[PDB]
Amino acid sequence: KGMISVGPWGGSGGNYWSFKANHAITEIVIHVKDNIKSISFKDASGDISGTFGGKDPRENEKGDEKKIKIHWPTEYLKSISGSYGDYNGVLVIRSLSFITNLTTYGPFGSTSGGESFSIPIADSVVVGFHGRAGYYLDALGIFVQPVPHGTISFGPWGGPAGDDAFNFKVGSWIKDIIIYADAAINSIAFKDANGHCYGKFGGQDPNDIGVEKKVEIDGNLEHLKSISGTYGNYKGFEVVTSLSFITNVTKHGPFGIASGTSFSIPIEGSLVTGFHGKSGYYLDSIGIYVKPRDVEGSISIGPWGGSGGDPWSYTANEGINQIIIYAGSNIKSVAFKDTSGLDSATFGGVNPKDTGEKNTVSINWPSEYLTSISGTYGQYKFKDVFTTITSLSFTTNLATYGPFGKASATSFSIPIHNNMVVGFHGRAGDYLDAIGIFVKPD
């Protein structure tokens, strides 16, 4: 269920409305003359939304009807564009286009006397609409979810160059942003909630590195929702000149100096889970990956095992697909891949002289899906003595995998049903001290 809200664009009059389709959106009905008088929708199984707007009593204000058909299932709605501006003294949607994987329908309505809006988005499917309406359509936005196996992406914003591409996604959340900036963004780097570090992207100029600044996000109160900033000329290059980091709680920034063309993205319900773009001497361009926060919550069970190691966690963006376990007489490390390409770091295995042997559990998701873990923990001795997970099995709705490592005296399991494992968490250092799961009903 969870979706990201984009926009809306237009004026602030009218009453809030939303429509979340129960099946793919296959028709958009609008009433148009100079502006958008009204809008409604229809889904693949004939369900309709109400009509939003169109409340002008004046008859010469009804507007002409246009039906946009989406040739489902080979064509699907992915985005919109259009324009807002004044109409009879009200800030209102004036024109609209509907962007599909195959073509664009529109523009509909007047394309003058406006201010246009568009969305630098990828891997999205529009699963609903929202906006403001009164007599007319004051404002319009969309509800998006990722495409199967994908991740919603916005941007990148900035210049066109940068010899070094970068691109990563996290399985926890962004906790630290380290920026060197002055008037421009010289470089950027990020830390996981697990402490894993991404990049330095940029900062290759020996005679110009900029001034450091750090943003530290407390996961108990705050989470990265979005970014904004500015890009334009720096010493002859087109690069990012300022950035702000937007959370549910506040705006951190701006860093660098605001010059050139400013950018932002009006999203709600989003957790930034990564970044992509290009860099070189400086940060040429940057974009975000974003995931819907759920309405659901996840239950956390465990962890079981020793009480050393640094805390770590991994939640699938989609479905956990693959588990890599290094084992010998205990468990050295654990790693996860998911159906959307989200690959965890390796948790454990920090000691090159004790790495164990690689094992792979491959899960055909979603027909097969993880269901719980069981195993043992206890003493393990290399040079020193440790308390770690020593043996470990994984259960799915279809089968059991392992055991891996060696059984020891203290065993654990979870008599659990009607659930699926959506993620893992625990503690690791040289080995896998402790491990637990995140679950959801089904």
Added chain:
Amino acid sequence: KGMISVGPWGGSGGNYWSFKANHAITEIVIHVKDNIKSISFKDASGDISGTFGGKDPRENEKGDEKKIKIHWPTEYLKSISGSYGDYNGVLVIRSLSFITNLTTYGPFGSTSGGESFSIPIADSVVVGFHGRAGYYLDALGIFVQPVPHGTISFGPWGGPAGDDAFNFKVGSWIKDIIIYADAAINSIAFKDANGHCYGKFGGQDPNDIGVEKKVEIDGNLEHLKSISGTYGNYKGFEVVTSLSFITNVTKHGPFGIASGTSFSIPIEGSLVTGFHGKSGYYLDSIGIYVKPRDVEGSISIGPWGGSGGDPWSYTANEGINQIIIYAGSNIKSVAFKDTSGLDSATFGGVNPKDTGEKNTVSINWPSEYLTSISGTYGQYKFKDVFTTITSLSFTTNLATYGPFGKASATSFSIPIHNNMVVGFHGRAGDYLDAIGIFVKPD
């Protein structure tokens, strides 16, 4: 979130629509002349639904606007009534009333040349609408949830007499219906999924007991959703003459003979969790309690303990409030009460010579709410030896209660977070062999 759907009433033309309010419904706007051209809604924070219907191009067909205001928060919508019939050759909603805890608004529209509908409902709050619409409002129904601490109730249907009132609600599900019938319903009785028996309601006539019939519902495929039947004259008395039991899978019945006035209730998303009415020699009247099935699911953890005892389970209708535990050196029995008055049977304690001592855990719900259990199980000897829960504690978001009984060698717990316990299950006989929990995220 889960709500019960009632209706809709009217014709089968138009397109399906629904509106689920995010805040209490405070306004209904209708366009009316002879029939209902169109409808829309507004909630406590200004959110609007779209307009449903009103698509006649003919301007002499727009209809007059009427605004029904709900004086929230002291007044709330509870039900509707109205009528459907023909209009320009289409089966359509013609009149409507809106029933509140304080008054009825309407009727609006024509009250002639229809067929009226009404709803014998109790303890409901309307949290949304659905229906069919095209040019006009072809059909309308409601979405309901129970009032705080209540249970939605329909009926009772039948005659006005019956010296013996009956009334019960189950914390699992209805598995067996035992009816004795010839031409009318002489008596009715029901079994829980736990095997607990309710009544015999009726059957007091020594010279007329009727013929037995049983309905056995398999919880793996099927669940009681609803009832229908007939009532009217039997040997001078006004009583229930036939009944059918409607599940998701089929209609079981009719039992007795269909004579007099027939009744039914068009509901979806419901689980029948009890019955109420009055009886004597025969079944004079019968009504149902229902609960919304969830969209959510519950995760089941455990049970822990011995492997004897009959399976039992209890799921709060609202919030678990009170736990009654009889203990001595092991656990004899367990029972539960919730904030809506749903009281479980006693699980365990079947032996009058070994009952232990009563204990009470009182939870102030919802500020305080159950979070998990822990304890021990092992041997306990009275005359024979048994393996049961021997000690038991309960954890809430605020505190821990117990231990009750006596610790023994095998202990259990659940390292769990971000959840609430919405119910219990296990096995019991003379004592509490085993116990587990149902959980949900939060």
